[PDB]
């Protein structure tokens, strides 16, 4: 056995702006209200070409939820990507994860659902074991349970019934 | 003029009358001065009694208002109105801000202005007789209206005004004028330098004058 | 310049001269012909104010025949 296992971690939602405001000042709102939770911005540890020549500050939003709003992630899983993600073909492990690109668009724009445009198409796997070694007090190494996502965390994005296998 | 003659305004001036013996009823003396003559805003007062000791003498309707909740902040007592739909038309100017802040005592309302007080509401009224003073405006304008009604002490704000007292009919001299001074504290002096800041004044009781300087 | 020497003559098309039909009498004869073509009494006859130019016959074949 086979007593317990399978659940949906968290819905790590993230846009990657690349300015201050009133731009990030948006990817926020957007995130925030697709979210219900608020918006943990993102730093900016340091500099170079394509702008982003700022100290760790202002250049993306993090807000990422979990649990009951489980399906709230696959709330465009199937949808957004027709329930098809990095498929084919070796070891049935087709890039455990799913491609992406930035997101956004909204000063007027209309709610969603899909829309909001492509987005952070991941928040995914890596096998199993236990429950709280990410604990506190008497911490620990999870068990020796399950398969490196893949041969396990694939057969549970395969019973959300969709393409990748 | 802060001289020997203080007890000429007090001792020698305590049984002047204007007729025969000296009557047969109670007495009523004091010691006139002011509040600070500053401008009823920036700096002119703080805390600490003299005394002194008194209250009204005649009326006390002063100033307290701001919102629809400031009316009840003048209902179980009696004060002036700042209005609601007037701070954007006519709740301040000259005879306006006056109205609400121009009574006799000073002010005991709260605060709420924003970007308007450099020449209108909060502004035009200061040395007139009010400009947001210390009246513990948080629970209302009654408990701190112990500093705005009775006891006292002698809250001296707005335009001049204050109080004084020591004895009754006749039994004070060095401590009569020195009782008038005693009837003065954070109004005759205070923190960094304040032993004097005026020119003259008045005093008596009911008799006739006091200091003839 | 320099090399531009005689630019003109070099560029000129050398035309040939009308090989003498007959001859040009040289002697009292020429002075005679002239005397006849101009100071002979038939020309001193018509007005001395309306007699032609000793070269109006610029060699014009059309006015050459009209006169003769």
């Amino acid at each position: 056995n086979p007593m317990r296992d399978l659940k949906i971690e968290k819905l790590v939602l993230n846009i990657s702006v690349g300015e201050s405001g009133d731009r990030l000042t948006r990817a926020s709102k957007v995130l925030e209200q697709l979210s219900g939770q608020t918006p943990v911005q993102s730093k900016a540890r340091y500099t170079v070409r394509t702008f982003g020549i700022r100290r760790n500050e202002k250049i993306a939003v993090h807000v990422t939820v979990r649990g009951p709003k489980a399906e709230e992630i696959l709330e465009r899983g199937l949808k957004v990507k027709e329930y098809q993600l990095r498929d084919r073909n070796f070891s049935a492990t087709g890039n455990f994860g799913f491609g992406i690109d930035e997101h956004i668009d909204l000063g007027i724009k209309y709610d969603p659902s899909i829309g909001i445009f492509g987005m952070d198409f991941y928040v995914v796997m890596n096998r199993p074991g236990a429950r709280v070694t990410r604990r506190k007090r008497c911490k620990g190494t999870v068990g020796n349970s399950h398969k490196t996502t893949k041969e396990d965390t694939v057969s549970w994005f395969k019973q959300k019934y969709d393409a990748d296998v | 003029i802060t001289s020997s003659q203080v007890r000429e305004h007090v001792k020698e001036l305590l049984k002047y009358s204007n007729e025969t013996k000296k009557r047969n009823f109670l007495e009523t003396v004091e010691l006139q001065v002011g509040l600070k003559n500053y401008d009823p805003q920036r700096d002119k007062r703080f805390s600490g009694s003299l005394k002194l000791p008194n209250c009204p003498r005649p009326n006390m309707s002063i100033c307290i208002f701001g919102d629809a909740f400031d009316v009840d902040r003048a209902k179980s007592c009696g004060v002036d109105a700042m209005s609601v739909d007037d701070l954007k038309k006519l709740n301040k100017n000259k005879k306006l801000i006056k109205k609400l802040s121009k009574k006799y005592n000073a002010f005991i309302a709260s605060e709420v202005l924003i970007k308007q007080v450099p020449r209108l509401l909060g502004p035009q009224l200061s040395k007139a007789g009010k400009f947001p003073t210390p009246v513990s405006h948080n629970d209302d304008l009654y408990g701190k209206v112990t500093d705005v009604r009775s006891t006292i002490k002698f809250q001296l704000k707005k335009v001049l005004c204050l109080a004084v007292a020591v004895g009754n009919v006749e039994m004070e001299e060095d401590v009569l004028v020195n009782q008038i001074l005693m009837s003065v504290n954070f109004f005759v002096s205070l923190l960094k330098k304040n032993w004097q800041n005026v020119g003259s004044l008045v005093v008596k009781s009911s008799m006739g004058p006091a200091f003839r300087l | 310049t320099l090399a531009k020497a005689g630019k003109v003559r070099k560029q000129t098309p050398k035309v040939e001269k009308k090989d003498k039909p007959r001859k040009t009498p040289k002697g009292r004869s020429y002075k005679r012909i002239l005397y006849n073509r101009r100071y002979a009494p038939h020309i001193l006859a018509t007005d001395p104010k309306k007699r032609k130019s000793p070269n109006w016959h610029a060699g014009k074949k059309e006015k050459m025949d009209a006169a003769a």
């Binding site: 949808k79 957004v80 027709e82 899909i114 | - | -």
Partner: protein
């Protein structure tokens, strides 16, 4: 998850309907703006019909190797017909022929609307 105006197929059946006579069946008529309707309901040319078929052969014969045979034309006055979508027609502008991939969106619009007739202005002095 994107779709198209009024259903690319309904129109192939709408255009090539029972009476696929005049290039623009009275069906497609209900769809076009007054100016276009005006023209067709008025007097459209036949050449515009042989040009039609020239795209036809280009769309099928070409393998799924997505390499369409560019069809050349001066008929800049032609209003894209439903079945004209997908083919790359070379349209003359003034200098040469312009190759344009016909999308579903450019229908009811004048074929000339894509063959830039002049190069706008850059600057400096």
């Amino acid at each position: 998850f994107t779709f198209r105006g009024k259903g690319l197929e309904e129109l192939t059946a709408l255009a090539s309907g029972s009476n696929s006579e005049k290039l623009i069946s009275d069906e497609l008529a209900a769809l076009f703006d007054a100016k276009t309707r005006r023209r067709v309901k008025r007097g459209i040319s036949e050449k515009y019909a042989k040009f039609v078929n020239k795209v036809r052969r280009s769309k099928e014969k070409c393998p799924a190797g997505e390499k369409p045979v560019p069809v050349k034309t001066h008929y800049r006055s032609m209003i894209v017909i439903p079945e004209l979508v997908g083919g790359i027609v070379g349209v003359y502008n003034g200098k040469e022929f312009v190759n344009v991939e016909v999308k579903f969106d450019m229908i009811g619009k004048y074929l000339a609307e894509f063959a830039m007739t002049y190069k706008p202005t850059t600057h400096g002095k």
